[PDB]
Design an enzyme around this catalytic site. Structure first.
Site, PDB file in Angstrom:
ATOM      1  N   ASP A  17       0.812  -1.224   0.000  1.00 23.60           N
ATOM      2  CA  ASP A  17       0.000   0.000   0.000  1.00 23.60           C
ATOM      3  C   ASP A  17       0.849   1.279   0.000  1.00 23.60           C
ATOM      4  O   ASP A  17       2.056   1.225   0.235  1.00 23.60           O
ATOM      5  CB  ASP A  17      -0.977  -0.015   1.182  1.00 23.60           C
ATOM      6  N   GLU A  27      -0.318  -0.600  -5.051  1.00 27.45           N
ATOM      7  CA  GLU A  27      -1.262   0.531  -5.045  1.00 27.45           C
ATOM      8  C   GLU A  27      -0.612   1.801  -5.613  1.00 27.45           C
ATOM      9  O   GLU A  27      -1.136   2.905  -5.469  1.00 27.45           O
ATOM     10  CB  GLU A  27      -1.832   0.775  -3.641  1.00 27.45           C
ATOM     11  N   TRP A  28       0.521   1.605  -6.280  1.00 29.24           N
ATOM     12  CA  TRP A  28       1.358   2.662  -6.850  1.00 29.24           C
ATOM     13  C   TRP A  28       0.634   3.707  -7.741  1.00 29.24           C
ATOM     14  O   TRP A  28       0.776   4.904  -7.493  1.00 29.24           O
ATOM     15  CB  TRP A  28       2.563   2.004  -7.549  1.00 29.24           C
ATOM     16  N   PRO A  29      -0.169   3.272  -8.744  1.00 32.51           N
ATOM     17  CA  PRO A  29      -0.819   4.290  -9.589  1.00 32.51           C
ATOM     18  C   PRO A  29      -1.842   5.149  -8.830  1.00 32.51           C
ATOM     19  O   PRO A  29      -1.938   6.352  -9.088  1.00 32.51           O
ATOM     20  CB  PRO A  29      -1.536   3.466 -10.676  1.00 32.51           C
ATOM     21  N   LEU A  30      -2.583   4.528  -7.907  1.00 30.03           N
ATOM     22  CA  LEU A  30      -3.587   5.205  -7.079  1.00 30.03           C
ATOM     23  C   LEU A  30      -2.999   6.321  -6.203  1.00 30.03           C
ATOM     24  O   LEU A  30      -3.580   7.404  -6.095  1.00 30.03           O
ATOM     25  CB  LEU A  30      -4.345   4.181  -6.204  1.00 30.03           C
ATOM     26  N   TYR A  31      -1.850   6.062  -5.587  1.00 30.25           N
ATOM     27  CA  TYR A  31      -1.217   7.052  -4.711  1.00 30.25           C
ATOM     28  C   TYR A  31      -0.340   8.043  -5.467  1.00 30.25           C
ATOM     29  O   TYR A  31       0.231   8.959  -4.874  1.00 30.25           O
ATOM     30  CB  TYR A  31      -0.456   6.362  -3.579  1.00 30.25           C
ATOM     31  N   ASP A  51     -10.704   2.729  -2.993  1.00 27.50           N
ATOM     32  CA  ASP A  51     -11.222   1.492  -2.393  1.00 27.50           C
ATOM     33  C   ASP A  51     -12.698   1.236  -2.703  1.00 27.50           C
ATOM     34  O   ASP A  51     -13.539   2.125  -2.591  1.00 27.50           O
ATOM     35  CB  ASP A  51     -11.062   1.518  -0.871  1.00 27.50           C
TER      36      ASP A  51
HETATM   37  C1  LIG Z   1      -4.625   0.487   1.415  1.00 29.17           C
HETATM   38  O1  LIG Z   1      -5.432   0.809   2.555  1.00 29.17           O
HETATM   39  C2  LIG Z   1      -6.178  -0.283   3.139  1.00 29.17           C
HETATM   40  C3  LIG Z   1      -5.405  -0.937   4.287  1.00 29.17           C
HETATM   41  O2  LIG Z   1      -5.472  -0.105   5.456  1.00 29.17           O
HETATM   42  C4  LIG Z   1      -6.619  -1.303   2.084  1.00 29.17           C
HETATM   43  O3  LIG Z   1      -5.670  -2.374   1.977  1.00 29.17           O
HETATM   44  C5  LIG Z   1      -6.791  -0.615   0.728  1.00 29.17           C
HETATM   45  O4  LIG Z   1      -7.338  -1.537  -0.220  1.00 29.17           O
HETATM   46  C6  LIG Z   1      -5.477   0.021   0.233  1.00 29.17           C
HETATM   47  F1  LIG Z   1      -5.770   1.067  -0.534  1.00 29.17           F
HETATM   48  F2  LIG Z   1      -4.755  -0.860  -0.448  1.00 29.17           F
END
Ligand SMILES: *[C@@H]1O[C@H](CO)[C@H](O)[C@H](O)C1(F)F
Ligand SMILES: *[C@@H]1O[C@H](CO)[C@@H](O[C@@H]2O[C@H](CO)[C@@H](O[C@@H]3O[C@H](CO[C@H]4O[C@H](CO)[C@@H](O)[C@H](O)[C@@H]4O)[C@@H](O)[C@H](O[C@H]4O[C@H](CO)[C@@H](O)[C@H](O)[C@@H]4O)[C@@H]3O)[C@H](O)[C@H]2NC(C)=O)[C@H](O)[C@H]1NC(C)=O
Ligand SMILES: *[C@@H]1O[C@H](CO)[C@@H](O[C@@H]2O[C@H](CO)[C@@H](O[C@@H]3O[C@H](CO[C@H]4O[C@H](CO)[C@@H](O)[C@H](O)[C@@H]4O)[C@@H](O)[C@H](O[C@H]4O[C@H](CO)[C@@H](O)[C@H](O)[C@@H]4O)[C@@H]3O)[C@H](O)[C@H]2NC(C)=O)[C@H](O)[C@H]1NC(C)=O
Ligand SMILES: *[C@@H]1O[C@H](CO[C@@H]2O[C@@H](C)[C@@H](O)[C@@H](O)[C@@H]2O)[C@@H](O[C@@H]2O[C@H](CO)[C@@H](O)[C@H](O)[C@H]2NC(C)=O)[C@H](O)[C@H]1NC(C)=O
Ligand SMILES: *[C@@H]1O[C@H](CO[C@@H]2O[C@@H](C)[C@@H](O)[C@@H](O)[C@@H]2O)[C@@H](O[C@@H]2O[C@H](CO)[C@@H](O)[C@H](O)[C@H]2NC(C)=O)[C@H](O)[C@H]1NC(C)=O
Ligand SMILES: *[C@@H]1O[C@H](CO)[C@@H](O[C@@H]2O[C@H](CO)[C@@H](O)[C@H](O)[C@H]2NC(C)=O)[C@H](O)[C@H]1NC(C)=O
Ligand SMILES: *[C@@H]1O[C@H](CO)[C@@H](O)[C@H](O)[C@H]1NC(C)=O
Ligand SMILES: *[C@@H]1O[C@H](CO)[C@H](O)[C@H](O)C1(F)F
Ligand SMILES: OC[C@H]1O[C@@H](O)[C@H](O)[C@@H](O)[C@@H]1O
Lengths: 390, 392
Positions: free
Chosen positions: B139, B172-176, B200
């Site tokens: 994440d 979760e690289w592209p999302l952040y 999410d």
């Molecule tokens: C990261 O945040 C939560 C975990 O606290 C969850 O895994 C979510 O899908 C994420 F964006 F990956």
């Protein structure tokens, strides 16, 4: 409205949400707005136990009319879609032991664009009575003024009375007044058996939520006016259709019972799941909705994405609904002191608590000192009945 | 990611949507994040046909860690909720023929506030490998520097590689990256087996719609980067829970198949309806998702509250999904010339059409010049499989 009717909230079936303004009988003969559709529903209301459960009013909504009035300036049903006319249809519905509802509009046109009743209130009322109509839904579209709105709803109310026939009078009066001027509910109640306050329901959880939120936000204004002969109408039950999860369907049924709401199903009685049917025909839940005291419930508490609603019933009983508004995760625990319920009388000195929804379960005796604890599903509701132990 | 893994989209179960960060094992023991939950979920994956259907990865999400790292500077499982440790849980999972997923974060803390992996990429990677972990979800919380984000994701990728153990790397690289600049998907694909693009998911039709609309809005950017070894991740399957009608659940299953999405169920396998189970284990629909060609589908058409999506399949076959987005009334008819489907290739000179969803029904032979006519429930989807044929 002091007409001896709707002493408990009206229960029946109304076509609008599920069947809308479908005029395409060529391509869609089984779902277009036609005499056949209402015959089919009438038959099933009897054969599938709906009438036995209290659903008595089979109701036509918009798009039943021919485009023009007849030679005598009276409303007429579409000649191709209603080839036998309304009177004949009412005869059929009556022969089944059911009642017939119809639809008109206070303004110059109905919302779908068919003839309005402005200028014709007295003849339209007499026509409806002559046809053996038992209920009128009176919509508020194409009304150019606040004054014409009030006068029209009052005029029609009085005109139906002078026919001498018992006709349930359902008004969209407050809904079409709201944007301009806040409703006088004592006035509306004087003229109407029930009244729509809020925007049309659709087949969605978003819609259910907004109606619940509208009702609770406005509850100081609307709760105390409701009672035998005059009810707040939060719109049709959409259980048995496509857009609600099982838990969301439970919430609508539970809360429409809390709200002492009229129960007009808008669904396809020919194609309905066993689960949706059993919930809609739920004896104990209908009995709460139909409580003879006719005191509308209200939101008691809101916090941590839970809501608590309650309703006072006959014989010192109370109904209590607990909604989980959190739309993520799983069943969440909620607890409340029973002393906080029913204004502190429901469970003083004690009460017996029976859970009705999502399933029926006896919870047992609760002392004045007790706490009620439940797990509530996301978007679901727990509905309880509390019986004071004297 | 060229590690030989995720040649088809990964399938399994992930705790997050249904269980989240429930730490209260005293008052909520059945839904708190504990080793017993994962053990029991593993048993049901086997006994209830989930593994047979292809759901292989039992994945731990956030909130498994103890508050602090140990004296060796390594992560530890919470001692109260995971008293036996990850190694023993991985052993238990493998002995049921399943694989174990775990979770960490590129920043200084995980999203829920537990130890981050920054400064510890190599040991954490090695820790997981020593523990017998088979998948890592990584994440992006508590990393407000574009540089550190990219560097950490790249580092962890290489760090896992050097352990020698096959580990599916979920990013979760592209999302952040969104709040700063548009992602470079060639770069992400190089380092990750799949990647979360969007916010999410939760247990709602609203959330499904927003994910679909985000995907189709962004399709020119994300569709073609997907392929064996690297998938777009539109988030967990939430079928079997509380917020979706049956038609909405069909919509999610169908469209996750069109999108060549990883299939991570987030539900309670102990409490799930026969209908939701049958949908999630639908072999023909799963086969579309797992198609060996690994070409992501796309939105073909949109208008009058309808959507037409299609996906090219191996051997000149196509999946077609028709969505009714009108949330009022009844089933609506939609007609399309089969010539418009599958780039005009699916039904040239003919195709055999089988409906897969909402029910399985053979529709027959369709000539190239012919029209396909369906009725679609409000918020529902009709899923069709088109098989190119020389016959009729
Ligand atoms: C990261 O945040 C939560 C975990 O606290 C969850 O895994 C979510 O899908 C994420 F964006 F990956
Ligand atoms: C046109 O509009 C008029 C006036 O608004 C309506 O008249 C009302 O009709 C209802 C129902 O028929 C009447 O309600 C019934 O009245 C009976 C006797 O009432 C007397 O006492 C009241 C005291 O408040 C006086 O106002 C009235 O003048 C009478 O002296 C009652 O016996 C009825 O009791 C019912 O309920 C009880 C308990 O709930 C049950 O035991 C019975 O089953 C019974 O059904 C009832 O209360 C009302 O009084 C009338 N109002 C007036 C002012 O006359 C017309 O109905 C309406 N016409 C049409 C066709 O809509
Ligand atoms: C750490 O990082 C490195 C670098 O990415 C990884 O090493 C790569 O691993 C992959 C997958 O194991 C290797 O891909 C394999 O290449 C082989 C082909 O080699 C030659 O021969 C073929 C002819 O077949 C030529 O086309 C090619 O140019 C080469 O000259 C194949 O044997 C493999 O194919 C089989 O599996 C694939 C699925 O991956 C199927 O698609 C095929 O049909 C077939 O069954 C495979 O393609 C890759 O070569 C490696 N890269 C390098 C630079 O060495 C490590 O795996 C990684 N360590 C970890 C994380 O454990
Ligand atoms: C129903 O319509 C009548 C007819 O007039 C219409 O409204 C006009 C503004 C214009 O749009 C015309 O094309 C329509 O035919 C309304 O009666 C009129 O009311 C206005 C003031 O509201 C008044 O000045 C006129 O004298 C009226 N005209 C006639 C023909 O008598 C009427 O108000 C409408 N009723 C409702 C409830 O909306
Ligand atoms: C993780 O945190 C470390 C530690 O620094 C923290 O964050 C600072 C902004 C400040 O609030 C401190 O009190 C905290 O302890 C970060 O490492 C530092 O990076 C900065 C560059 O911004 C550098 O000047 C310092 O020398 C670094 N300190 C150490 C201990 O080496 C790091 O940036 C954070 N990592 C991520 C991925 O966000
Ligand atoms: C709301 O409407 C009601 C009914 O039209 C009004 O109540 C009447 O008030 C008059 C005096 O103004 C009395 O003569 C009547 O006895 C009342 N009728 C009823 C039904 O009680 C009331 O005035 C209106 N309130 C407001 C704030 O406008
Ligand atoms: C995308 O990023 C990679 C860095 O690995 C680079 O090779 C490529 O040129 C970049 N493309 C664009 C358009 O910036
Ligand atoms: C009036 O408009 C439509 C009919 O066209 C429908 O009946 C709705 O519920 C309304 F608001 F009453
Ligand atoms: O809108 C349709 C197009 O969408 C693209 O993303 C896809 O790669 C193309 O094959 C397709 O023609």
């Amino acid at each position: 409205l002091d007409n001896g009717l709707a002493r408990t909230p009206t229960m029946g079936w109304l076509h609008w949400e599920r069947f809308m303004c479908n005029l395409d009988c060529q391509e869609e003969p089984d779902s277009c707005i036609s005499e056949k559709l209402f015959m089919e529903m009438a038959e099933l209301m009897v054969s599938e136990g709906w009438k036995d459960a209290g659903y008595e009013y089979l109701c036509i909504d918009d798009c039943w009319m021919a485009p023009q009035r007849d030679s005598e300036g009276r409303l007429q049903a579409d000649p191709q879609r209603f080839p036998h006319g309304i009177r004949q249809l009412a005869n059929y519905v009556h022969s089944k032991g059911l009642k017939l509802g119809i639809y008109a509009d206070v303004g110059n046109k109905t919302c779908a664009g068919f003839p309005g009743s402005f200028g014709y209130y007295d003849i339209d009322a007499q026509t409806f009575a002559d046809w053996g109509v038992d209920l009128l839904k009176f919509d508020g579209c194409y009304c150019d003024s606040l004054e014409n709105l009030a006068d029209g709803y009052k005029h029609m109310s009085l005109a139906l009375n002078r026919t001498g026939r018992s006709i349930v009078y359902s008004c969209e009066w407050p809904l079409y007044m709201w944007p301009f001027q806040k409703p006088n509910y004592t006035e509306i109640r004087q003229y109407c058996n029930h009244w729509r306050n809020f925007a049309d329901i659709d087949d969605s959880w978003k819609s259910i939520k907004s109606i619940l939120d509208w009702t609770s936000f406005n509850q100081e204004r609307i709760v105390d006016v409701a009672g035998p002969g005059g009810w707040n109408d939060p719109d049709m039950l959409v259980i048995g259709n496509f857009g609600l999860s099982w838990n969301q369907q439970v919430t609508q049924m539970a809360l429409w019972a809390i709200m002492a709401a009229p129960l007009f199903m808008s669904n396809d009685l020919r194609h309905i799941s066993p689960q949706a049917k059993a919930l809609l025909q739920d004896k104990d839940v209908i009995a709460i909705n139909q409580d003879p005291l006719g005191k509308q419930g209200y939101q008691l508490r809101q916090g941590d994405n839970f809501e608590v609603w309650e309703r006072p019933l006959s014989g010192l009983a109370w109904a209590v609904a607990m909604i989980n508004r959190q739309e993520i995760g799983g069943p969440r625990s909620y607890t409340i002191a029973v002393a906080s319920l029913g204004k502190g009388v429901a469970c003083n000195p004690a009460c017996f608590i029976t859970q009705l929804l999502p399933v029926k379960r006896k919870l047992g005796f609760y002392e004045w000192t007790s706490r009620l604890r439940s797990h509530i599903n996301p978007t679901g509701t727990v509905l309880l009945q509390l019986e004071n132990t004297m």
